[PDB]
Amino acid sequence: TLTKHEQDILLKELGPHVDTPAHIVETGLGAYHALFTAHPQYISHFSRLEGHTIENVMQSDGIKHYARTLTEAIVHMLKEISNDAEVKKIAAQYGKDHTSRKVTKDEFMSGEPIFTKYFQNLVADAEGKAAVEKFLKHVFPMMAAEI
């Protein structure tokens, strides 16, 4: 798992992407955009997005809700990453929050490489890009266990 320094560095580099209400939504939007471009069939699995296509999903109201809650969840896990017990608990709950019968463990897990590339591209440098991957590779399976 992340060392204290890796957590600090990642928080620093993600900070300017997760500060303002707008940036928090913006960050989440990009992640889902990447996800739906690779897997447009996942769109209909998000209840608020039903009927949208990849052509128009980014303009829905629903995607802003999802964008906000995604960014918030990622940041929350990052902030607790040095608390083994807490991050495990938070991660498990976020997995459980994926109640929809439309989403499976395997579908969830397929988002890992996509979110990894996205967040790596979003952060500034090599040290942050490596920390992103270590961070996501660690937390994806934690959440998926409860899906």
Binding site members for heme:
98
| CB of residue 85 to ligand HEM, shortest distance in Å | 18
Question: How many C-beta atoms lie closer than 10 Å to residue 71's C-beta?
Answer: 22
Q: Convert residues 84-103 into a mask of x (bound to ligand HEM by CB under 6 A) and - (unbound).
A: ----------x--xx-x--x
3-state secondary structure of 98: coil
| R_g over Cα of the chain | 15
Interface residue with ligand HEM, options 12, 20, 37, 48 (CB under 6 A): 48
| CB of residue 9 to ligand HEM, shortest distance in Å | 19
| CB of residue 71 to ligand HEM, shortest distance in Å | 9
Contact range with ligand HEM by CB under 6 A, out of 4-12, 16-24, 39-47, 78-86: 39-47
- In what helix (H) or strand (E) does residue 29 lie, and over which residues does it extend? helix 21-38
| CB of residue 10 to ligand HEM, shortest distance in Å | 14
Q: Which residues make Cβ contacts (< 8 Å) with residue 101, sequence separation at least 6?
A: none
Is 42 a binding residue for ligand HEM by CB under 6 A? The answer is yes
Is 47 a binding residue for ligand HEM by CB under 6 A? The answer is yes
Report the candidate in 105, 89, 117 with the shortest Cα–Cα distance to residue 141: 105
Report the candidate in 79, 78, 65 with the shortest Cα–Cα distance to residue 24: 65
Is 144 a binding residue for ligand HEM by CB under 6 A? The answer is no
Distance, in Å, from the CA atom of 117 to the CA atom of 34, rounded to the nearest integer, reads 9
